[PDB]
Design a protein around this ligand. Structure first.
Ligand SMILES: Cc1ccc(C(=O)Nc2ccc(CN3CCN(C)CC3)c(C(F)(F)F)c2)cc1C#Cc1cnc2cccnn12
Length: 286
């Protein structure tokens, strides 16, 4: 190891107390940790953080993936609705990528655990939707494309604030593998815009399509999209302009939003800037 030292981002690893694993990724692993003095004004002050390090039985490509990921994260910048990079540990030990801890975990499982027999009110549901749209609007302003916007990649803090993250996906040979079923049985192709799935074209508008799927997940309280459609059957359905039906207890105002995001033509889909405005109008009204 001979990784460069960026004092701006560098944090002493001895100021980290590692704890509870939060999840195994495809090249890294996220663990919960206590950090001391993340704020140099309060150097003995504890704070809860999440640390990404290399997975067990890791190769040289995995290290390059975690390094490239670290380099991208340094440029993302700070915004209330995107995961915030706090520091890194690159010197005299294993490579650590530190971000803020979102105490309530990923949005999919946050929603799934809070299904009524209720903890989730409709205006809190709109807020989750609005917050994710706000984060995405920031990403697009920084010319950043997500490629895999889903509820499972959005995190929930103790205060129910949404933070866009990116944990997946497995690599194929030369490109990302969207077809591989995740550990949690998720099929990533179900969030893919037609131009991303059929033409390998990724824009902010393809992320808009993905947002429409994420919206469906919020308003089904963590439902899996196209509830019983194998991925082979899904392709014809999409080509032929068929879209998911309005869910059991989803207001038309929000289902209409999903439909705008799923317009076959990327140019006829709204922008994240227009989605923030329409979700703010719904949130204010409710
Ligand atoms: C430790 C850690 C490290 C990294 C990341 C991470 O998400 N990195 C990230 C990488 C890239 C991108 C953007 N790209 C997308 C692809 N794209 C093609 C290029 C740009 C983004 C994004 F947020 F901007 F989207 C984030 C999250 C965590 C976490 C955590 C955490 C906190 N609480 C909990 C609780 C349970 C589980 N985890 N956890």
């Amino acid at each position: 190891l001979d990784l460069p030292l960026d004092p701006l981002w560098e944090f002493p690893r001895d100021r980290l107390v590692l704890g509870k694993p939060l999840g195994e990724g495809a090249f890294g692993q996220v663990v919960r940790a206590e950090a001391f003095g993340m704020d140099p004004a309060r150097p003995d002050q504890a704070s809860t953080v999440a640390v990404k390090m290399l997975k067990d039985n890791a190769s040289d490509k995995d290290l390059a993936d975690l390094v490239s990921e670290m380099e991208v994260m340094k440029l993302i910048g700070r915004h209330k609705n995107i995961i915030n990079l706090l520091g890194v540990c690159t010197q005299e030990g294993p490579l650590y990528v530190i971000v803020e801890c979102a105490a309530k975990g990923n949005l999919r499982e946050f929603l799934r655990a809070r299904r009524p027999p209720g903890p989730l009110s409709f205006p809190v549901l709109v807020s989750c939707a609005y917050q994710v749209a706000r984060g995405m609007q920031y990403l697009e302003s920084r010319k950043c494309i997500h490629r895999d916007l889903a509820a499972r990649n959005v995190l929930v803090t103790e205060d129910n604030v949404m933070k866009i993250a990116d944990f997946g996906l497995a690599r194929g040979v030369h490109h990302i593998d969207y077809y591989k079923k995740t550990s949690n049985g998720r099929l990533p192709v179900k969030w893919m815009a037609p131009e991303a799935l059929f033409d390998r074209v990724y824009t902010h508008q393809s992320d808009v399509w993905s947002f429409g799927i994420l919206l469906w997940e919020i308003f089904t309280l963590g439902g899996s999209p196209y509830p019983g459609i194998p991925v082979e059957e899904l392709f014809s359905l999409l080509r032929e302009g068929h879209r998911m039906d309005r869910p059991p207890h989803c207001p038309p105002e929000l289902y209409g939003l999903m439909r705008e995001c799923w317009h076959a033509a990327p140019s006829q889909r709204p922008t994240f800037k227009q989605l923030v405005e329409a979700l703010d109008k719904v949130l204010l009204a409710v």
